[PDB]
Design a protein around this ligand. Structure first.
Ligand SMILES: Nc1ccn([C@@H]2O[C@H](COP(=O)(O)O)[C@@H](O)[C@H]2O)c(=O)n1
Ligand SMILES: [Mg+2]
Length: 291
C-alpha cells in the first residue's frame, strides 16, 4: 500500500493535499500499471520552469524574447506594460475563467503583434536563450532522464512560444525523443524572419481545444491509461481532455502567486498542490516508485 506519511517529500510544508487517501489510491494505481501504462501531460512555463530564484522573478518563454537584445527598448517597455496589466488579470482571483478569456486573447494579439514588428530571426533564438535568465525546476535532469530511460510519452502543452521552449530544453540536454511539444510556433518568412505564428492560438484558457486537436497523438497511446498531469494554472486542468482512455489520473498543481486567495480553489481542483515550490521532487518520487 502507498502511505504518504512514510514519504518525506510529501510532508514538506509546501505540499498541500485535500484528499490524502485518494492520492494514495491513485499512486497505488500508477505503481500497479508501471511504465507500460504511464504517460505525462505537462504545462511548461512556471510548471517545468521556475517562477522565481533567489527572490527574483524568472522569465516565461515570451519574457525571454521581451527581454532580449533583438527587441528595442521601446518595444520592451510596451511589452513590460502589457505584462503588468494582463498578468494581473490572468491571476485575478475575483474573475471567472470566462471573464479572463477575452483579455488573454487580447494580450496575445497585442504582444504577438509587437514581436512580429521587431523581425525576430530564427538563427538568433539559440543565442537569445543561451543569454537569458530562464531556469528549469530543481530535479529536471532526473525527471526527463527517468522518463526517457523508460520510454514514457511526455506531452508538453504550452501557451508560450514553441521555438523558445524547444531551445530551452535542447540547451539543457533534456529534449529527448519521448518529448512532444505543442505550443505557439513561429512562422518565418523566406529570410528566416518572424512574420507570424502557425496554426490556432493556444492561450491560458483554451487548452481544451488543442487537447482535442491532438487526438492522433492520444489515440496512439490508448494503452497509456495512467496519466500524471502537471500544471500551474486552472486552465491546465483541461490538458488531458483528449486522452483516449483514463484509468488513473493524478493532477499536480504548482501554486506560485496569490496563494492565500487561491489555495482553496487549487486544493479542490488539483490532487496535490505545491505551494511556492521550485522543485520536481514530489513527481520524481512518484516516478521512482512507479517505473
Ligand atoms: N505575451 C505573453 C503571453 C503569455 N505569457 C505567459 O505565458 C504563459 C503560458 O505558458 P504555459 O502555458 O507554458 O504556462 C501564461 O501563463 C502567461 O503568463 C507571457 O509571459 N507573455
Ligand atoms: Mg504555466
Amino acid at each position: 500500500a502507498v502511505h504518504l506519511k512514510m514519504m518525506p517529500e510529501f510532508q514538506k510544508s509546501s505540499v498541500r493535499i485535500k484528499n490524502p487517501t485518494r492520492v494514495e489510491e491513485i499512486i497505488c494505481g500508477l505503481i500497479k500499471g508501471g511504465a507500460a501504462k504511464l504517460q505525462i501531460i505537462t504545462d511548461f512555463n512556471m510548471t517545468l520552469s521556475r517562477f522565481s530564484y533567489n527572490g527574483k522573478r524568472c522569465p516565461t518563454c515570451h519574457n525571454i524574447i521581451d527581454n532580449c537584445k533583438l527587441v528595442t527598448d521601446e518595444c520592451r517597455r510596451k511589452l513590460l506594460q502589457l505584462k503588468e496589466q494582463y498578468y494581473a488579470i490572468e491571476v485575478d482571483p475575483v474573475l471567472t475563467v470566462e471573464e479572463k478569456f477575452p483579455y488573454m486573447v487580447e494580450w496575445y494579439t497585442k504582444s504577438h503583434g509587437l514581436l512580429i514588428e521587431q523581425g525576430i530571426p530564427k538563427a538568433k533564438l539559440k543565442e537569445i536563450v543561451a543569454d537569458s535568465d530562464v531556469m528549469l525546476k530543481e530535479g529536471y535532469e532526473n525527471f526527463f532522464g527517468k522518463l526517457q530511460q523508460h520510454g514514457i510519452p511526455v506531452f508538453i502543452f504550452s501557451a508560450g512560444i514553441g521555438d523558445v521552449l524547444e531551445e530551452v530544453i535542447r540547451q539543457a540536454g533534456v529534449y529527448h525523443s519521448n518529448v512532444k511539444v505543442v505550443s505557439n510556433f513561429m512562422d518565418f518568412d523566406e529570410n528566416g524572419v518572424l512574420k507570424g505564428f502557425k496554426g490556432e492560438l493556444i492561450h491560458v484558457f483554451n487548452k481544451h481545444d488543442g487537447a482535442l486537436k491532438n487526438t492522433d497523438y492520444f489515440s496512439q497511446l490508448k494503452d497509456n491509461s495512467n496519466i500524471i498531469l502537471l500544471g500551474d494554472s486552472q486552465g491546465d486542468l483541461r490538458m488531458a481532455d483528449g486522452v483516449a482512455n483514463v484509468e488513473h489520473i493524478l493532477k499536480i498543481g504548482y501554486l506560485n502567486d496569490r496563494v492565500d486567495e487561491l489555495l482553496e480553489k487549487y486544493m479542490d481542483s488539483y490532487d496535490i498542490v505545491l505551494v511556492k515550490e521550485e522543485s520536481l521532487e514530489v513527481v520524481n518520487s512518484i516516478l521512482q516508485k512507479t517505473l
